Amino acid sequence: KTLIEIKQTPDGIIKADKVFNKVKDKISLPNRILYLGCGSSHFLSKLLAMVTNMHGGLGIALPCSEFLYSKETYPIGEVELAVGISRSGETTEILLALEKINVKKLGITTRESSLTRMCDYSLVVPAIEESVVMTHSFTSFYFAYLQLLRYSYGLPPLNAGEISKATEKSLEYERYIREIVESFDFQNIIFLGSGLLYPVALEASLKMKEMSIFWSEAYPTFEVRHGFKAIADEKTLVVLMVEEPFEWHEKLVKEFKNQGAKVLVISNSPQDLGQDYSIELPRLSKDANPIPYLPIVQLLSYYKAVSRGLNPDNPRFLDKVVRW
């Protein structure tokens, strides 16, 4: 089901737009927003917090358990809205977190659930997934909320059709991605991204980790030179995700190749940075631009998993919903 779900990304964008239009005039997102989630939903929370800041607001993201047990170490301050993100809407930690919150609560989930019952409003984006690994729901949740955020902040709406078609372009790379997995049997991998693409790198790494029971890491693009690069050699694939690369990116690619690693560049640029593999995606509004990158990293993780005889639908030791 994992592959089928990744391929439903284009439709997920359309479903998200529909939900946005249904609730847009029922809730107005404020300036100070706290985002809470676990696992992939935490990485989505980080992404939402980032785009909130990008558009002039003040967003902070924290893992549910850190809010539950160590909130004093985080710069939360006054919260005008608390957003709880949970694909299942049943994760014990998010429910525990929200019951401690008194301010307005907005839930983001795929279904009517325990979560929606404890929130004042909710974005129920029906990007249903049977797989334990979150795929198109991440992308769909992001778009639905982004539309709502832009709307609340007085910005023009994004073109859902254009963005959905952009993800169809990402899916055209399926065979090429399969070829990467077939031609280079990497033993570990590093995902790199800056700004909005950093949370995407974190999510990408988790996809690879869950689906492939793999050694995968993720870092803000240039932070990797600070010790982290020591574990990259001829058995490593480095995935650099960048919208508009500059000289430092070319130097970084060269640096990794000098260590023997192979480099895959996913960008919105026609520039040759010296990469071994290249995936060019349609450039969109800066805030929506990360969307087409998700299906690419999801497909890469899926095919690497299959190449190891693993079942991405039900990774060993994992539960679909973490409960306590």
Add this chain to the structure above:
Amino acid sequence: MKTLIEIKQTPDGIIKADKVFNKVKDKISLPNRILYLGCGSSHFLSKLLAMVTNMHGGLGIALPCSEFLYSKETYPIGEVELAVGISRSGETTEILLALEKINVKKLGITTRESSLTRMCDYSLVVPAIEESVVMTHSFTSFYFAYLQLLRYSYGLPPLNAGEISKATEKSLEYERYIREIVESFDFQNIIFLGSGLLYPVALEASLKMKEMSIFWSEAYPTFEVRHGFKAIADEKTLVVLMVEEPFEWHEKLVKEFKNQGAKVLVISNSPQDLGQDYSIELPRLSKDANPIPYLPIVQLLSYYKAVSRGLNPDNPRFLDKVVRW
């Protein structure tokens, strides 16, 4: 070899830090809104400082230098009353580039007079000198020096340096125990876990293992690990749980990892048996200083694992002591 010698200078580093603090305490006033910038281990130290700043009623945010340089708009920086640039060498290009773009007051934290100190309004020069490419005792020394300055600035009483230094001497007493774990359980990957102030310590611990042993190491906020990340832990994995005051969930988590076949080392300030295979109890200190004794433990673990693999922690492959552009 200098790495082990440097790890063992942790106790003295605390004393050196206290001396610097007392020399500059009335020359530097720390504000409410502070931005912390650093790279690599210095970034993880920045996260720790930002957290303790929040813990004490201030507003601290930490960012890797390059993210501030090229993607600051995606972060909740807001109004900055002070920018703190952390760099052991004081020569990292990214920190120099970051600070020159800032107009507000700038404080540097480094081990030596350098390019960094020359562009800051003032600096905490803590002479915890290190020849190893891997940062060790300078991390805790920098932390203590600033922590004292923060407490003083915020009207709180001073921490007892001698007591904290002694606490790290207790950490070092576990050297044999740690060496023997490395010699008996040949783990192939490792996961460090910590919450609150111990999360940045887990991040730093993981980097120490990564740099010193060219190892597969990961770090996560304690309970976040159940959310998919735990899939890579099995009988070849050592899970290191760092916790000051464990409760019911910690015992359950330890048991969950053992059920996957992994062995668990618990480093805590509690005598409670959570079911761990290995146990290291450290002296409990003031909440803000409590993380200090944990550093030499993880540094020693990374060092011995490196030696067991015939690797030289002083000069990890591919690494430059100072990253320049």
